[PDB]
C-alpha cells in the first residue's frame, strides 16, 4: 500500500499562534550584545518574522529574548520585529560623556530607516549617557521610550531622576516605570501601538489609557501612584506634583495601563502616533505621485495637484476620529475643522522658479478629544 502523506501533510503540534494584524510601525530593540553571525557591524539592523525565527540571539538572554517574548505576546500579534546593534560599544571609552552614544546612533540609521519605536532594555537603565537619546529622538520622526526598573520616582521632590530632570520639556518620549525583571515597553508599544489601522472608521485609540498588556503583574501603592504618573486625584494632572510616567495598576482584579502614556503635562501618546501616521501617509502618497505622472508643471495647475494629497488624507483621517467635527467648542457654533491653504505661484519670480522646489502648503487641524475621568452627583431627596 502507501501512506496518505503522498498527497497531503497534516501535523499536530502544541503551541500558541496569534493573528497577523498588520499595523503602522515597527519597534527597535538596541543593546550591546551581538551574535556576530548576522549582526556584526555589517547589518546593524535585522528583521524577523516570529519567535520561532529568533535563533541567533540566545533563547535566555536578558535583552532580546526576555523582551521579544513579551513583545510577541499580545492577543493580536505584531509582525517583523527589528533587532538592533547600536550601542555595541559599552557606552563609550569614557562613559561620563555621551558623545560616543550619539555617534553610535548616527551610524545605525544609514543601514536602514524603517523602525518607528525605540525600546532599550536589560541594559542602559538610567545610565547617564542614555540622556543623549532624549536629545537625539527630538528633531526626528520617531518615538523612543525607556522603562526604568527602579528609582526615586516615589519622592516627588527629587530632581536627579530621569523623569524629574526632564519633565514637560520633551514631547517624544515616555517612561514605563515598574519594578525589576519586567520587560514592559514591548508589552504595549508596538504590540498594541503597532496593531492599529487608522484608515478604518472609528479606529482612533486616542486614550491608550485603559489597556491590558500581554502577561505581566501589578505594582502596589495608593497615594504613591500620584508621585509617579503625576496625576491629581480630581482636578486634573499637575506637572509639578509628580513625574509623568506609567505603571500598569489594577483597581478590580483587572490590571491595566494607567495615565495613558503621557510625555509632558498633557501630551498623550496617541496624539503623537496619529500625527506621525498622517505625515508618513502624506509622504508616501506624494512619492506615489511623481512616479505615476511623468511631470508636474510649475503653475497653479500643478500646485492644486499637489494639494490634492493632503485634501484627501485629512478627509480620510476625520473619518477615523482624529479630527474634530466642525463645531467650535467655545460656542458650539460653526467653524471648519480643517482648512488647506495653497500659495499662489503667479507672482514667484523666475530666479526662485529655476530651483524646481515648490512653495509650502499649509494645513490646519482640530484635535478630537477623549475622556479619562467622570463625575456624577447623585442628589437624593427622599
Amino acid at each position: 500500500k502507501l501512506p496518505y502523506s503522498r498527497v497531503t501533510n497534516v501535523t499536530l503540534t502544541r503551541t500558541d499562534n496569534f493573528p497577523t494584524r498588520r499595523g503602522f510601525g515597527t519597534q527597535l530593540i538596541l543593546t550591546h550584545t551581538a551574535v556576530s553571525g548576522q549582526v556584526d557591524a555589517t547589518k546593524r539592523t535585522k528583521l524577523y518574522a516570529s519567535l520561532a525565527e529568533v535563533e541567533a540571539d540566545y533563547p535566555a538572554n536578558t535583552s532580546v529574548y526576555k523582551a521579544a517574548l513579551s513583545a510577541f505576546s499580545q492577543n493580536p500579534r505584531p509582525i517583523r520585529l527589528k533587532v538592533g546593534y547600536a550601542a555595541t560599544p559599552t557606552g563609550g571609552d569614557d562613559a561620563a560623556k555621551k558623545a560616543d552614544f550619539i555617534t553610535s546612533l548616527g551610524a545605525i540609521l544609514n543601514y536602514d530607516q524603517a523602525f518607528y519605536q525605540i525600546t532599550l532594555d536589560a541594559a542602559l537603565r538610567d545610565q547617564p549617557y542614555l540622556d543623549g537619546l532624549v536629545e537625539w529622538v527630538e528633531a526626528q520622526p520617531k518615538i523612543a521610550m525607556i522603562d526604568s526598573n527602579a528609582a526615586g520616582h516615589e519622592d516627588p521632590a527629587n530632581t536627579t531622576v530621569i523623569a524629574a530632570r526632564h519633565k514637560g520639556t520633551v514631547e517624544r518620549t515616555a517612561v514605563f516605570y515598574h519594578t525589576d525583571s519586567t520587560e514592559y515597553l514591548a508589552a504595549s508599544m508596538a504590540a498594541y501601538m503597532s496593531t492599529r489601522v487608522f484608515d478604518d472608521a472609528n479606529s482612533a485609540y486616542t486614550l491608550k489609557f485603559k489597556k491590558a498588556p500581554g502577561v505581566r503583574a501589578i505594582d502596589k501603592g495608593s497615594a504613591v501612584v500620584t508621585a509617579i504618573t503625576g496625576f491629581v486625584e480630581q482636578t486634573g494632572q499637575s506637572e509639578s506634583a509628580g513625574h509623568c510616567a506609567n505603571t500598569l495598576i489594577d483597581i478590580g482584579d483587572q490590571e491595566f495601563l494607567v495615565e495613558g502614556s503621557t510625555l509632558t503635562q498633557n501630551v498623550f501618546l496617541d496624539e503623537i502616533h496619529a500625527t506621525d501616521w498622517i505625515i508618513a501617509r502624506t509622504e508616501e502618497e506624494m512619492l506615489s505621485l511623481f512616479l505615476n505622472n511623468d511631470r508636474v508643471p510649475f503653475t497653479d495647475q500643478g500646485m492644486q495637484q499637489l494639494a490634492s494629497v493632503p485634501r484627501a488624507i485629512m478627509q480620510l483621517a476625520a473619518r477615523a476620529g482624529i479630527v474634530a467635527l466642525d463645531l467650535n467648542p467655545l460656542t458650539g457654533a460653526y467653524e471648519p475643522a480643517y482648512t488647506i491653504t495653497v500659495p499662489s505661484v503667479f507672482d514667484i519670480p523666475e530666479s526662485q522658479r529655476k530651483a524646481r522646489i515648490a512653495p509650502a502648503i499649509q494645513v490646519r487641524f482640530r484635535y478630537a478629544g477623549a475622556v479619562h475621568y467622570s463625575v456624577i452627583n447623585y442628589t437624593m431627596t427622599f
Binding site: 505615476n292 505622472n293 497653479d300 495647475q301 492644486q304 490634492s308 485634501r311 484627501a312 478627509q315 482648512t339
Partner: protein, 142 residues
C-alpha cells in the same frame, strides 16, 4: 489677488494621482451631484411643522472624455481591475484655483461605464463614479 475671470485653464482635477486631460466640449464636462436631499419638511394636519436632516453625505461625479484620452485608458484599466475582483478606493479630487471651489473624496468606485459608439465622428465617453463621503471645500476667495 483680484477675483479673475473664470477659465478652464485654472481648474485642476486629479484621479488617483494622475491628472485628467482629455475632456469633451460643452458647458458641463465634470459634474458632481449629491446623493440625496439635505432635508425634508413635514407639515401636519394642524399647521405645525418638523424638519428632518439626513446623515447621507455621499456624492456622484460624471466625467466626459474624448475617445482618445489617457484618462480613458486609466479608467478602463481600473474597471477591469474591479471586474477581476480587486476593490480599492482611488481617491478623486478637483478644484478651481480662482475661487477655491470644488471638493475631494477619499475612496471612489467606478459605478457606470461608457458606450462604445464608433459612427462617423468622435463621440463622448461618460464615466460615473460614486463616493461614500464627499467633502466640499469652502470658497474662501468668494
Amino acid at each position: 489677488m483680484a477675483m479673475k475671470a473664470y477659465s478652464m485653464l485654472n481648474v485642476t482635477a486629479t484621479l488617483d494621482g494622475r491628472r485628467v486631460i482629455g475632456l469633451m466640449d460643452g458647458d458641463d464636462a465634470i459634474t458632481t451631484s449629491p446623493g440625496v436631499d439635505v432635508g425634508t419638511m413635514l407639515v401636519g394636519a394642524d399647521g405645525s411643522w418638523l424638519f428632518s436632516q439626513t446623515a447621507d453625505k455621499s456624492a456622484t461625479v460624471v466625467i466626459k472624455l474624448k475617445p482618445n484620452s489617457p484618462t480613458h485608458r486609466q479608467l478602463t484599466e481600473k474597471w477591469m481591475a474591479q471586474r477581476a475582483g480587486r476593490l480599492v478606493g482611488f481617491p478623486f479630487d478637483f478644484i478651481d484655483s480662482a475661487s477655491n471651489e470644488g471638493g475631494t473624496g477619499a475612496e471612489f468606485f467606478i459605478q457606470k461605464a461608457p458606450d462604445d459608439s464608433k459612427g462617423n465622428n468622435a463621440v463622448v465617453r461618460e464615466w460615473t463614479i460614486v463616493t461614500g463621503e464627499w467633502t466640499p471645500t469652502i470658497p474662501t476667495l468668494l
